[PDB]
Amino acid sequence: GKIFTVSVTVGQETTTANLIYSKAKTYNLPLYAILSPSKVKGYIFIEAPNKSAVEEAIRGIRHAKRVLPGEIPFSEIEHFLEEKPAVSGFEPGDIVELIAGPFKGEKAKVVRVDESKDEIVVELVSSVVPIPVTVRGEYVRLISKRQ
Amino acid sequence: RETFVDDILKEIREIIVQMVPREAGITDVEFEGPELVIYVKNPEAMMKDGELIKNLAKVLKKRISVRPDPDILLPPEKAEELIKQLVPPEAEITNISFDPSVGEVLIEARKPGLVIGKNGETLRLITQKVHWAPRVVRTPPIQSQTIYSIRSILQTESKDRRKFLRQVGRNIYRKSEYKSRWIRITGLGGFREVGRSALLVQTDESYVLVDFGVNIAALKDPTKAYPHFDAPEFRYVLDEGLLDAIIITHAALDHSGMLPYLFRYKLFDGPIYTTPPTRDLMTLLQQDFIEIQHMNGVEPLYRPKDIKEVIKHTITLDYGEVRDIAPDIRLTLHNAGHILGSSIVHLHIGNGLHNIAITGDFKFIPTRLFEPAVSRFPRLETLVMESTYGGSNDYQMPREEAEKRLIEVIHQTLKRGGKVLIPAMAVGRAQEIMMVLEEYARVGGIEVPIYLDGMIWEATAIHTAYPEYLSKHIREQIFHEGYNPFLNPIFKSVANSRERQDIIDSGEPAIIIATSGMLVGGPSVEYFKQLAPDPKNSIIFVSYQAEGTLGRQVQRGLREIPIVGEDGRTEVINVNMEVHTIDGFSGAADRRELMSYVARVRPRPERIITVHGEAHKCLDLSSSIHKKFGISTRAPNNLDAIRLK
Amino acid sequence: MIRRETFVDDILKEIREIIVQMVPREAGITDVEFEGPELVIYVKNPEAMMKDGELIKNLAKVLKKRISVRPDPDILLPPEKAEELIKQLVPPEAEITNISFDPSVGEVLIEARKPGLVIGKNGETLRLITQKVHWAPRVVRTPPIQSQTIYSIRSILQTESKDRRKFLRQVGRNIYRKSEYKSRWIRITGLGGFREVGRSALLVQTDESYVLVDFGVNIAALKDPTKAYPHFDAPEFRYVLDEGLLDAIIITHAALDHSGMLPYLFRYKLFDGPIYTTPPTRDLMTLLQQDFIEIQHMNGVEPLYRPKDIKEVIKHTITLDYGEVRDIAPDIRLTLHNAGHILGSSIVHLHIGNGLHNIAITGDFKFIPTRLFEPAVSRFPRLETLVMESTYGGSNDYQMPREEAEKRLIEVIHQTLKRGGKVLIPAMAVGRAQEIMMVLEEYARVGGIEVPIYLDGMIWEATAIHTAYPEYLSKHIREQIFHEGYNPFLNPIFKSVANSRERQDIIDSGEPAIIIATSGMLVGGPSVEYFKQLAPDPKNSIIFVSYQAEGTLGRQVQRGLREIPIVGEDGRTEVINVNMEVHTIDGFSGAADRRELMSYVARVRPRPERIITVHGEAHKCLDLSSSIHKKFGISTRAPNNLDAIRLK
Amino acid sequence: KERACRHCHYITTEDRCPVCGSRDLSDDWFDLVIVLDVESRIAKKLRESIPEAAKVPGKYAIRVR
DNA sequence: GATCATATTGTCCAGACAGT
DNA sequence: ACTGTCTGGACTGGTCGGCGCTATGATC
RNA sequence: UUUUUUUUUUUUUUUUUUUUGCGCCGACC
């Protein structure tokens, strides 16, 4: 059908999607599918023939705020369904920020990238001596792209 | 990696329930660092005497820590009342703390010997009548800020400390007694150089780092200020988190300066095995180093929270206590005699496979402060020795005439009404000077007050907190007699700048022991500035003065020194005071002392490694040892790996 | 592979700018890229590139890199027209056999019996033909004796051209990831072969690059994997392999104790990168690995690796010649010099930094002249650290001289051929067997013997490889092959069997003959069958040229025991009676003795600062190190395994 | 805890896999996908990405780690 | 039973402006 | 060019003292 | 019967002197 956006509480998109799915199953709502990417915070995607079905499905839930008044083209959310490694798309020599891990809130420079083990080796920029460290690909965020 | 800690714990529990009578009621058996903890419901039957605990410790070859079950716990007020009633009034108990999570009561007393008992029977009596496992620590006669802060940090983070100890105990006993296929020794720093010491002990199962330190002389160059972080073995150990433990020989910046840096960037998460005096002194020195780097305007190496994390990850070991820090490595500490808490690291890898002794900084002659270094070991194959004074012509003067000259110079200065200013290190020579002065003044030689400014008072308090780590004479005076040499009324502490100004402006003679040997900071510079024009005063140098420092300028004989004034104009200091230099109070071992230690060590090591000194000095010491005793000697450079077995 | 900083783009831009400044406009530079150590330049109009031969030499000297000039793929002659032009333009005496084209890179592979005519004086013929054909030429020698191994390797390389080109491009990008860099420290860790024989492993580590030298396996202690394989548990080796920081692997010579562990890395994808070795060494080590897996399968034990791993090793091997300086790392330069041990044996010379340090790893080598190969090179431009073998480092380890050993072999063959007796010489396919055939051919050249010699097994393949690579042989053999026009290998007395029927009917023929077979330990192959069928034959002689290990049939034969019970196939045992005299001549070994080692130390130039003795027994290594230190005053060491020595 | 199958990318609360019967399930997964209609556009997009996904309506995971 | 992210988006005077 | 309409704004100074108010739902 | 790589010395210690805001209500001049 048509892709619609539902604004939900940040960090609790999966539970809201599960409640919407259970309500649709129990009450026979005309809901086609629900997509809740982990990278997107506070927003979920629901496929329905019309926005009235989405509005009727999300009502009665404290954690579903409102439905965005618009229709998303499928090309915008097409890349979300494709499975790609988090390490891929990273090149050595640039600067990244570590969102999670033991090095939370630290800037680092990418040194080595390998897609086989899904790990990326980075060097802290604030360290007085270069100490390479191995961190997960999804933990880092690209601040700038140079070389 | 694969672990078998559960099977080992099950076997240990089976052995315990086979040996311990059933009436004890054993509930839980777990590992807390390098010691075993057993929880029972009837402590009376478990420890009616020390023979059962001794037999259990001998059979299991572990440190047994019997604790009551948390369900059977007396109320804290009733427990405190019972503990106070049981302990004799001679032992003045100051603070009592309780741990609701695990059965343990911390007792702070001025006389821990009475609380512990003649053979530990008082601890058993307390934990039987009160159902609380007792831990006794000494309350120092002089209050120490660092020790109080460390104790408060340990008490306020009990849950994190217990979790860290449980993780360390699980990691240590991941497998049973394992015979290492090979033993490797690599030096990441401190090899053929002075400072930034770093020793890595590598086996096929566990890795051990020894005295991770920093260099202050070459702090401008990052390639020489810090140990070699680019070593492939060290990189592999740090990246995979295979570092089992870190052991610090003694509390100095060249042996413990780089320790908080690992915790700053979360490069390490295991335990640190130092003596409590070493831990306290190294925390004080690291805090002072961070403050100095902050004041100089440069970027600090780490933060005080990193020092707090180092405190939270430190396990305290006493002298002569054997603990298992790895599946194949056993660690014990022996007295070194260099400074307070200085320990010679002895590693027992395997079940008699090999033995390594890392002396570090040590002294082999008796001193006024500490006993000479331990030269007897149960087994010794490889010896790692310092070479600070390894030169052939390096011969420090004997102590007795050096202290006689110091005493006569001080007496001559005080005879004419002058003031004696003695710049000194925060730890080491300063306490020896205070002990010599106290001995001289105890017979009524001098009545003038002795003023300690800066870190001298804190170091003195830390020294008072651990009298068992001192020499036999001071131990006999403190324990057998009622006299404490550090508690002499002549020793006074100046609180603020007003007290220092009153001391300077006072016409009465006095002795001032500052905390900066090079007159590069602290109250030493102010004392020198305000006492230089007076010809009656004198300044005594007890340490080497580096080039480019004010102290070297005064020592060389400069009558006037141009300095920057408060208003931004050049100021001239007229040095009319007498200048003296007595370098006989150095805590480092002499070349003759090193040769005597090599000759008198038992058993004779198969090989000797000379480190911690200049390259030519290390080579000269190794060649002299090889020519005199025939033992094979090596003086490897940095990033050099030696396969001992 | 693993992605790195890869600053090669700026270096390539600077190199292209220098080329544009130096080379004229009419050359037409289109694409400049790195294919391994060499530099590849694509030109639209190659006519103006090489009107004079001095321009390419000047460009190579300025850029300090090997330069291969190829035409742009946009313009290319048709393969049939190009082949016709090449055939009709080269002299007819070149005898071109096979021509292969690679349109992806515009390179043509030419196989001829005489590559010298194709190349000509300083490459003038090569330049002229590639100017007239618009195709980059590569010339290899077609052996007079057909070689299955070399032909298979060439076919694999040709059929896998695109992946080989991608691998070469990746290697070239990894090599020049930085400019001329001066290393801060150099250390060498011995993962194997230190104070022991076999399973050698030398790891050269700098602050930027890591180099592995002579990764081999041990066959004497193959039962215990700890003593058979190099130390994989070393923290430095684990860090290098896990992070993929191994820049290159260099093999001194083809042996199981120097190159037996190579397919293991590619089997489990442990290492991905270039391997630098001499092409004879590559062919012989592939043959040795195939023999090793074959005998492992025959013994019933699980093989260490599959032949596909050997194919992967072949596809990841870069071939270098003697005296060719190539860059394998941003700070390390590699040069190969003759060693004289076996065919293709090389002495690894490493030039780390810009004059910072130099390391020479001799490995197995010989210093006296040899009929097969020239003596080892003792002169180097710069030398500071020397690593040499110590197999015969003992004071009493003096070997029996070759000349009178050859006299004894000649008189033995005379006394066994006057009576018409058969000869059996068990020897390895790579080692002393070729020297034995050369000695026999020289003896038969005068006219002393005319009985043909039969080579059974892998001896024919080694002979074919030797014919394919005659430039690596001795000066006398090179002279005879090139200017005299006589091939000692092509003597009519040298015969090769076809199958088991030829072996059977030459066994039952009864005529006197000389038989050379592989598996000198008599653990398998045609040697055991030949000995079984030769034991009851009266009046025959067998000559042993190598040391015999315990627990083998050769040791029992050497012991002179009258009764030799040998267990046969299908679980049944057989008993034979021997009346066959045994001869022991251990004078053809390719390992230098103590006197040769001392002579090499004394005559080396320049004198190294330190000498490291490896590849031998611990007592022999210590004795050799102490003797060198006492005689010459050089600081020598005999390090154990897992020992790192900081050099600079 | 909820774990996702490595084959069909199906999240189930029991050891048995009700789609392919696989015994290897991963406890770490992101980008939960809920499928209620087989002929959905996102279900069709997931089908060409992972062949085993969107066969039966229910919870699904984009990647398995 | 302890912690952690998140937590929604009164009338009148004067100036500017569509409307006729 | 007039005329009714929309929008913005300021709403006398000081002083006295009192009286509340400044998290919450969901795992682990 | 054979081509295109290079080579060497000057920067020192184990460390130091004081409740803001919000709104309401009452009241004085």
Ligand SMILES: [Zn+2]
């Ligand atoms: Zn030290």
Ligand SMILES: [Zn+2]
């Ligand atoms: Zn060899």
Ligand SMILES: [Zn+2]
């Ligand atoms: Zn499944």
